[PDB]
Design an enzyme around this catalytic site. Structure first.
Site, mmCIF file in Angstrom:
data_model
loop_
_atom_site.group_PDB
_atom_site.id
_atom_site.type_symbol
_atom_site.label_atom_id
_atom_site.label_comp_id
_atom_site.label_asym_id
_atom_site.label_seq_id
_atom_site.Cartn_x
_atom_site.Cartn_y
_atom_site.Cartn_z
ATOM 1 N N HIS A 53 58.566 55.585 33.821
ATOM 2 C CA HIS A 53 57.970 55.638 35.174
ATOM 3 C C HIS A 53 59.006 56.067 36.231
ATOM 4 O O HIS A 53 59.965 55.246 36.516
ATOM 5 C CB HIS A 53 57.353 54.305 35.542
ATOM 6 C CG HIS A 53 56.539 53.661 34.481
ATOM 7 N ND1 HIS A 53 55.383 54.227 34.015
ATOM 8 C CD2 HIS A 53 56.775 52.591 33.694
ATOM 9 C CE1 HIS A 53 54.860 53.460 33.069
ATOM 10 N NE2 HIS A 53 55.733 52.482 32.797
ATOM 11 N N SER A 76 58.603 60.969 33.317
ATOM 12 C CA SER A 76 57.847 59.697 33.450
ATOM 13 C C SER A 76 57.121 59.419 32.140
ATOM 14 O O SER A 76 56.783 60.354 31.435
ATOM 15 C CB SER A 76 56.909 59.728 34.601
ATOM 16 O OG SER A 76 56.271 58.490 34.807
ATOM 17 N N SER A 81 52.331 57.191 37.360
ATOM 18 C CA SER A 81 53.329 56.152 37.736
ATOM 19 C C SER A 81 54.427 56.714 38.654
ATOM 20 O O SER A 81 55.155 55.905 39.277
ATOM 21 C CB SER A 81 53.899 55.480 36.533
ATOM 22 O OG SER A 81 54.586 56.368 35.708
ATOM 23 N N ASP A 131 60.078 54.069 27.131
ATOM 24 C CA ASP A 131 59.138 53.043 27.646
ATOM 25 C C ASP A 131 57.752 53.391 27.078
ATOM 26 O O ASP A 131 57.076 54.273 27.640
ATOM 27 C CB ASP A 131 59.137 52.989 29.176
ATOM 28 C CG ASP A 131 58.247 51.873 29.766
ATOM 29 O OD1 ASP A 131 57.351 51.426 29.104
ATOM 30 O OD2 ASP A 131 58.450 51.509 30.910
ATOM 31 N N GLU A 156 61.869 49.719 26.330
ATOM 32 C CA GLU A 156 61.483 48.864 27.487
ATOM 33 C C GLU A 156 60.349 47.891 27.139
ATOM 34 O O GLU A 156 60.364 46.771 27.655
ATOM 35 C CB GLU A 156 61.095 49.822 28.648
ATOM 36 C CG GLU A 156 60.837 49.058 29.973
ATOM 37 C CD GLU A 156 62.059 48.540 30.719
ATOM 38 O OE1 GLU A 156 63.174 48.818 30.265
ATOM 39 O OE2 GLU A 156 61.882 47.939 31.818
ATOM 40 N N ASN A 181 62.706 44.728 25.811
ATOM 41 C CA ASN A 181 61.509 43.921 26.155
ATOM 42 C C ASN A 181 61.812 42.423 25.908
ATOM 43 O O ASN A 181 61.398 41.632 26.749
ATOM 44 C CB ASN A 181 60.259 44.331 25.361
ATOM 45 C CG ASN A 181 59.013 43.623 25.868
ATOM 46 O OD1 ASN A 181 58.595 43.810 27.002
ATOM 47 N ND2 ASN A 181 58.424 42.775 25.034
ATOM 48 N N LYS A 186 63.981 40.131 30.893
ATOM 49 C CA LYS A 186 62.987 41.236 30.953
ATOM 50 C C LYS A 186 61.604 40.632 30.762
ATOM 51 O O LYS A 186 60.819 40.710 31.708
ATOM 52 C CB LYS A 186 63.355 42.341 29.967
ATOM 53 C CG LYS A 186 62.577 43.662 30.148
ATOM 54 C CD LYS A 186 61.114 43.596 29.859
ATOM 55 C CE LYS A 186 60.416 44.927 30.253
ATOM 56 N NZ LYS A 186 59.056 44.994 29.650
ATOM 57 N N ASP A 190 59.675 40.591 34.193
ATOM 58 C CA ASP A 190 58.925 41.882 34.327
ATOM 59 C C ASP A 190 57.484 41.692 33.826
ATOM 60 O O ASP A 190 56.570 41.702 34.687
ATOM 61 C CB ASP A 190 59.655 42.975 33.557
ATOM 62 C CG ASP A 190 59.090 44.362 33.707
ATOM 63 O OD1 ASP A 190 57.877 44.510 33.540
ATOM 64 O OD2 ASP A 190 59.882 45.320 33.880
ATOM 65 N N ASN A 191 57.319 41.323 32.553
ATOM 66 C CA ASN A 191 55.984 41.304 31.884
ATOM 67 C C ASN A 191 55.108 40.240 32.592
ATOM 68 O O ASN A 191 53.932 40.524 32.808
ATOM 69 C CB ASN A 191 56.107 41.010 30.416
ATOM 70 C CG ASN A 191 56.942 42.040 29.677
ATOM 71 O OD1 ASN A 191 57.846 42.676 30.270
ATOM 72 N ND2 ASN A 191 56.543 42.302 28.466
ATOM 73 N N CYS A 195 53.826 41.130 37.215
ATOM 74 C CA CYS A 195 52.328 41.268 37.251
ATOM 75 C C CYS A 195 51.686 40.240 38.202
ATOM 76 O O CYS A 195 50.746 40.657 38.899
ATOM 77 C CB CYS A 195 51.754 41.169 35.850
ATOM 78 S SG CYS A 195 52.207 42.537 34.744
ATOM 79 N N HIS A 315 49.823 49.040 28.527
ATOM 80 C CA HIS A 315 50.547 50.348 28.506
ATOM 81 C C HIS A 315 49.630 51.567 28.450
ATOM 82 O O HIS A 315 49.958 52.590 29.124
ATOM 83 C CB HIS A 315 51.561 50.358 27.362
ATOM 84 C CG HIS A 315 52.522 51.475 27.537
ATOM 85 N ND1 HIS A 315 53.471 51.465 28.515
ATOM 86 C CD2 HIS A 315 52.533 52.743 27.059
ATOM 87 C CE1 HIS A 315 54.133 52.613 28.491
ATOM 88 N NE2 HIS A 315 53.544 53.405 27.680
ATOM 89 N N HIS A 374 56.352 46.868 39.817
ATOM 90 C CA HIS A 374 56.967 45.566 40.216
ATOM 91 C C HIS A 374 58.011 45.829 41.310
ATOM 92 O O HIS A 374 58.612 46.921 41.397
ATOM 93 C CB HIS A 374 57.670 44.873 39.051
ATOM 94 C CG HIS A 374 56.814 44.652 37.894
ATOM 95 N ND1 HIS A 374 55.434 44.472 38.021
ATOM 96 C CD2 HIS A 374 57.111 44.494 36.601
ATOM 97 C CE1 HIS A 374 54.937 44.246 36.829
ATOM 98 N NE2 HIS A 374 55.945 44.188 35.966
ATOM 99 N N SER A 382 65.157 43.854 34.254
ATOM 100 C CA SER A 382 64.792 44.848 33.200
ATOM 101 C C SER A 382 65.883 45.909 33.066
ATOM 102 O O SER A 382 66.299 46.229 31.946
ATOM 103 C CB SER A 382 63.472 45.473 33.542
ATOM 104 O OG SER A 382 62.535 44.429 33.692
ATOM 105 N N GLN A 386 68.656 47.368 30.368
ATOM 106 C CA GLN A 386 68.660 48.766 29.868
ATOM 107 C C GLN A 386 70.106 49.289 29.874
ATOM 108 O O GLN A 386 70.526 49.889 28.871
ATOM 109 C CB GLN A 386 67.713 49.682 30.642
ATOM 110 C CG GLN A 386 66.244 49.571 30.186
ATOM 111 C CD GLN A 386 66.024 50.316 28.875
ATOM 112 O OE1 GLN A 386 66.962 50.781 28.269
ATOM 113 N NE2 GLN A 386 64.803 50.361 28.372
#
Ligand code: NAD
Ligand code: NAD
Ligand code: NAD
Ligand code: NAD
Ligand code: K
Lengths: 461, 461, 461, 461
Positions: A53, A76, A81, A131, A156, A181, A186, A190-191, A195, A315, A374, A382, A386
């Site tokens: 993204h 991307s 995105s 990702d 990711e 992930n 992360k 993130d997950n 959200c 995803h 996010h 995240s 990486q």
């Protein structure tokens, strides 16, 4: 005369740069790694193919990798995105990027191909940052000679990791990977937490619908499902949750949600008769969170309350049967990434028809499609993972090992807990948090180092 | 003429039985195991030493073990945790129990010894069910010959499991164990969700204090810390969280808590100068959740706001320096398990002194000490795991194995995820939840059986 | 040949119309009034000067007035609140509208003057619909002869009503008014519940900042203060509240907020010494909700944490001393309605300067400036009251009364409770809510009609 | 030799006194009035008949009135609401009190009669403090000669005020009254905020049921309904709300609750056919909050889910048709103020019957019956208003006025807003809150005094 890019509008670069300078101030773990590793240049000689993204936050990641000595070619991993100002700022820094908001599928495949090829021949790539695994799949299927020179993949997201683990089980994985992930900094941050912030954001920007006192059905209660259910509940939605995993279902019950199935007795036998018509006739919003296929199916879409909103924060868009809706129903664009789907038939629609659904982002990742994904201070976690993952695999130099030594290193691993903790500590300092130091007696008493790690690898948090 | 027990009052039995009959209706996983295994009698010949809080919910566990063929001898693992009506109902069914609310330390040790000895000689025990490792420690230190005939230990709580893992590392563990704590249907529902329910419960029963708009400091943000912080936040407390683990601290930030240390810059160098007296002078309530030692120390207790409440919901009272308070300060009983600790000196106190703290349950497990512990529908998950664990180890018959075979089976193991999911499903059905069944295509797509397990053993939930 | 309008871009009309057709489905009370009164044409002969935010929701209000027989001339009551697609759709329906997002103050006054004048002479207006009293003030100061022919004013908001009651107290009010603000179906829905939705929305769209675990200071805890505080708290912000009204302060305490003052001991004596610099150096976001002047003053702005966000959701920008910041500090546009304010001096800034504030909408109504204001289903309540108020005053025909009769009817009144309840019932039906019917015996027991009203006029809800 | 009392157990006095000394530290507005008015003795010569729940918090109110110069004679206004240790402590201070937990109806009437009569003849009473109007009703019907010498009534609760306003309308009210209920520092704090704390408290103490993930139906959404709904929702209950008032129903929608009726289309005709059996078959907990009659009727009780909990937090038990259940169903006591109601018949019951409801406090006020009522810090606001009300009416000396002067003062009034604000300020200081002082320019701008009052009398908060 830098021309090695394709973006919507290069004149958005100054705007993109202003937002990168703000995003930096919200990303202490990522900016900490810049300051720590700047001198050492641990990615000097790295040539990273990036597919993720093309947001402002991805920009801070790219410029971190470049600051540590890397060269990159970027695309991307989603057609909706990209932030065109982010893409513009990256191209304007002389970094090859092929990304714009609202690509076709043909343009999406072309952008990935532009990273892989430079002047019509394979780039000298030696690292992959992916990702969802679309870039990883193309390299394996179309460019196996390129993988011979690649040291590893840093993946990711849950869906990408699943696809890696399938390749490893089948003996088709050609280079080692780090599962980014499943760092706690992360997967939790993130997950789940991300959200909570970005799902209700995307639904407001897309629809401007009141959510308080309205009925939601969230499909899945994994990390994305938990974050998404909270995003809606904190706005005063009445949230129902579907699951296949009884442990996840039990968590939804204990979190104060009613656990329902779209199917009578949970039995998905493919009949219209199986659909709980009474339940789906009361739903104002359906969100798919699964990473699975067809969890919001044709018969569910037929049964949904008139003028329900439909979206996906997993995803891939195949969570929702959008193919059925394209085949059978008329799509009216309201505005970019918002369609009314008229359930009256295929060939035109009445402008005043009451029998439509609202689809966000054509069923693509809604938080990135109808908002900006996010916030920076979550993407900090995240993306610091990486950078550490890229450093670890690059320094191991898998591609240069003998065949016997390759066999021992061909795995999908996570980062060590000590690194996960060091990322967390930088994130906590960004909130002004103060972590207590163990006394030597306390450290002895619970059986840990004063420096950590503080938990066994089996700890769930 | 059954006399093989000691309880506060046998005449409470009928009342205990009324509450057992209600608790049964709230415990579908446990009652499911009764119905499933009644015929098979999988614990026929089991002789279980039990050491766990003698509550009504522990009553349903005991009567499930007995229903599946076991004989037991029971004690509580805490001096304040027993419900005397539960103890009475169990004694009245002809089951040896040695437990009452408000034991001395001398009486506590006597009660465990009465389970271990029958008619002045070691009982023919072949199974141990422990919560905190006190019974496990006594058997290892004082009755090693009894461990020769014991097939295993099933350990309930974080602190007990830590003590087992120390024995295993040191080669002093004599029989195999199941870590019941790290089933998801134990650690999530009991350690986290249970404390959301029972912590604010215990503080209301003990103090009747308004919590809304008042300041709390929660020490730790593990599972108990998370459940405890929520218990107070949902009442409208302003909660601050202390942590040594930056990952747990990061979760507290993301959950909307300010993360603070009792010490300046988090450094506990043991001086009064190190205490953040500004911070502790604002705190109305301190809760310890750590399983560590001296996390609310003498210098913190000296700096706390006048008339702050002080309590512990970790396993052991040594989280709080109560020895310091007994030595230096004067204790006024308000009512059972509620003391004012007068900081004016160690002898007398004036009834109208304003300079006191309120201690709950003398620093013992507050949710069991000042209330009744977790609700039945939560304890259902924990106790269903305990029954499955008892069945698994009893059937393995470690004590009967040859020496070489023992060496291979001497471990601390968890239950398989499939059993964890089967407990979860029964709990979901108790909320009227309906779990969706995967289609064969969906199960193929995410790479699982339609029957589960649904997640890899590395999944954190 | 329709040219009697000024909008940003007439080509946005079709897009505006698609959004109006959706918003109608969210506004059952307003669309109910259309259906009920269409035949009777109760506003036939009404010539309404409208001054209220030119949003899509205001579009449904305008087209409701026109459907009931009115002619209108429209402006926005805020330079940033217009949705250009809404303005375009209204102009394209042949309705005179003078509104675009990002007016200058000179353009703002020109737009109001274009409603008042048709072809350079006073329009034959006989009704006013106002939001904040800017149009009401211009008519009284500059066009008193026009007020001779006007039957009444229907005022939307707290600040406008205050200005009316000052005119009434001073004997300068020339026509009667309805206070629409103090219908329960306006003040609760709009002033409180609307700000729960739209405040966090505007701060996400403006900044994309994580709010969870960050520190906010909300100034005021009236209706807007309550809804704003909730908007931030439900995102996991640590919210502190300032108040002058100890009853409002007590509500903030009981709601779980800490009540603080920007000033040492609450005393604002205008010195830098009076600022609580420790407190304001911890604040990540400040929101003004008061309808008062200079509640976020020069000395507060100097003391705020570097890179704090500053915004206002009260009617007028003078809550914040933006004149001080224009005088002293350099403004960097990030993007429309987002400025960095560089505290390093007036005549330029380092692009990488860390010492700046982020100002939203230049201190103007943030929810309308940086997002779209309250959702349709909330604005339904407000605008249904506006339609009923317009009908009531138009039918009373004040301007046609004899002098003696005028004297008796010159007042600022609210709508009767029965009408407030009838609006509420239509809103409840839009959620699928089912209101219980009183039995005759129950209605006798509590002393109400089965048809209502259900509460005395003293009831606060 | 003080003997002018009746309590369960005088030996509980020392324990009661310890709790009074703690409660005082939580009640700064009440203890502020003691300190302010001690010297002046404004209730010197006051002889107060008191009828209100004989709790520890009522004890602080009694001893405040006595500290300010009053004599009192006390009873409880509910058979289950007394705390016997509070009653004991008051009797032991030489204060006539006639109260114990678990009175019969015959004992309840006897206790009120013992306050009214001293040594078999009317006491020289000149003030009434009532909660629900039972004492007010008896004085009017049986002791009219006593009302000739009484200066006023200070009425606590919604139900009591309704009964006063009926007497006023009928011309049967003999003495003026202050409605304490409609002070904002009473109605918000006590009626709403208090029930957030004490409802879930009473349900945990009474049942120890897990509320998270279970279904609740709350009847009514006035102040008690709002606080009760929040009490359950904050525990993770799925809360459905019933209302007759569409404005209150609209509030429940906006607050995130589904609004339902026990009756099909909200129409009760008193047939079983009218019951929504599907809805009531899903409910785990029903709570009545109305002050109305028969809002949980025989046909609702027939349709409720097996083993549902039933309770009332309105003033009178007749919200629930308990008379039907006493006539038709068998009551098994679980423990004090907890019954299983066996729906199998009237005679016996099977101890293992699954077809029962759990009734709390026999349908009497559940928060006082099964717990301790609201915490001290909330009751501080209510009771400070009672003291100010008692001072106001006592000083007015209605009983001593000429007939013509009486006629002008015979009303049901509230306290002035200035006093409401002074109570609020003391409560705010108890949380450590700091209220901002308006500058003279700000006070001019909003048109208030720097000292208040801050809002017009029409403001709803
Ligand atoms: N949009 C975002 O910002 C974002 C961020 C992280 C991950 N993701 C993606 O979102 C998806 C979910 O990720 P995750 O980490 O939560 O994965 P996860 O495996 O933790 O959760 C998925 C859940 O879906 C459930 N599920 C599967 N099939 C189902 C069915 N048919 N009906 C109901 N429940 C079903 C599973 O039991 C599981 O609990 C993935 O595709 C992931 O890559 C998106
Ligand atoms: N009261 C109950 O009903 C109940 C239920 C389950 C377990 N327990 C007990 O509660 C305790 C906690 O169990 P858990 O499962 O949450 O364990 P955990 O290991 O998940 O959590 C403990 C946490 O405390 C933190 N910590 C350690 N020392 C600290 C210090 N000095 N300052 C701040 N934080 C510190 C650790 O970093 C860790 O996150 C144990 O003693 C356990 O046996 C009680
Ligand atoms: N943005 C929107 O959508 C929206 C909607 C409704 C109203 N409004 C406007 O918002 C403002 C507030 O409206 P409201 O209905 O909440 O008014 P309100 O009178 O109910 O609340 C204002 C509060 O500000 C407090 N206050 C005043 N001066 C203060 C100071 N110096 N420091 C701290 N607190 C102070 C007052 O005590 C009062 O409680 C008005 O300007 C109104 O017109 C905006
Ligand atoms: N237990 C406590 O601590 C406590 C405290 C304060 C008041 N009370 C008592 O509780 C009751 C409620 O008081 P309140 O101040 O909330 O009153 P209220 O008038 O504010 O609210 C009562 C609500 O009941 C609703 N109602 C009436 N009949 C109904 C029906 N059949 N179905 C559904 N809703 C119906 C009304 O519309 C109203 O909104 C009174 O009896 C009061 O004296 C109890
Ligand atoms: K002592």
């Amino acid at each position: 005369g830098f021309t090695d890019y394709k973006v919507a509008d290069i004149t958005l670069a100054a705007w993109g740069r202003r937002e990168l300078i703000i995003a930096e101030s919200e990303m202490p773990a990522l900016m900490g790694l810049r300051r720590k590793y700047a001198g050492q240049q641990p990615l000097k000689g790295a040539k990273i193919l990036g597919c993720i993204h093309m947001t402002i936050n991805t920009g801070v990641l790219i410029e971190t990798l470049v600051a540590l000595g890397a060269e990159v070619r970027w695309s991307s991993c989603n057609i909706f995105s990209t932030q065109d100002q982010a893409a513009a700022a990256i191209a304007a820094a002389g970094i090859p990027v092929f990304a714009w908001k609202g690509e076709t599928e043909e343009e999406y495949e072309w952008c990935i191909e532009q990273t892989i090829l430079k002047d019509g021949q394979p780039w000298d790539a030696n690292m992959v940052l992916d990702d969802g695994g679309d870039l990883t799949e193309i390299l394996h299927k179309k460019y196996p000679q390129m993988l011979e020179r690649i040291h590893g993949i840093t993946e990711e997201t849950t869906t990408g990791v699943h696809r890696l683990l399938d390749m490893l089980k089948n003996g088709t994985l050609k280079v080692p990977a780090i599962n980014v992930n499943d760092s706690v900094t992360k997967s939790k941050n993130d997950n789940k937490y991300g959200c909570r912030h970005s799902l209700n954001d995307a639904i407001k920007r897309g629809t401007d619908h009141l959510l308080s006192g309205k009925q939601a059905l969230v499909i899945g209660y994994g990390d994305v499902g938990k974050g998404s259910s909270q995003s809606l509940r904190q706005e005063g939605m009445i949230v129902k949750v579907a699951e296949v995993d009884p442990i996840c279902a039990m968590q939804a019950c204990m979190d104060g949600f009613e656990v329902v199935s779209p199917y009578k007795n949970g039995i998905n036998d493919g009949t219209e008769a199986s659909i709980d018509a009474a339940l789906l006739g009361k739903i104002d919003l359906i969100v798919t969170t699964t990473g699975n296929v067809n969890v919001c199916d044709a018969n569910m879409l037929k049964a949904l309350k008139k003028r329900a909103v439909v979206c996906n924060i997993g995803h891939f868009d195949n969570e929702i049967d959008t193919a059925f809706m394209r085949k059978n129903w008329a799509w009216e664009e309201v505005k970019p990434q918002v369609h009314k789907i008229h359930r009256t038939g295929k060939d035109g629609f009445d402008a005043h028809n009451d029998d439509y659904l609202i689809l966000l982002a054509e069923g693509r990742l809604v938080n990135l499609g109808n908002a900006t994904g996010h916030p920076s201070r979550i993407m900090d976690g995240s993306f610091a993972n990486q950078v550490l993952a890229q450093i670890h695999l690059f320094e191991q130099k898998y591609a240069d090992l003998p065949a016997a030594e390759k066999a021992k290193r061909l795995s999908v691993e996570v980062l060590p807990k000590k690194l996960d903790e060091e990322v967390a500590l930088e994130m906590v300092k960004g909130f002004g948090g103060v972590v207590t130091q163990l006394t030597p007696k306390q450290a002895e008493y619970i059986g840990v180092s004063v420096e950590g790690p503080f938990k066994p690898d089996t700890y769930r948090y």
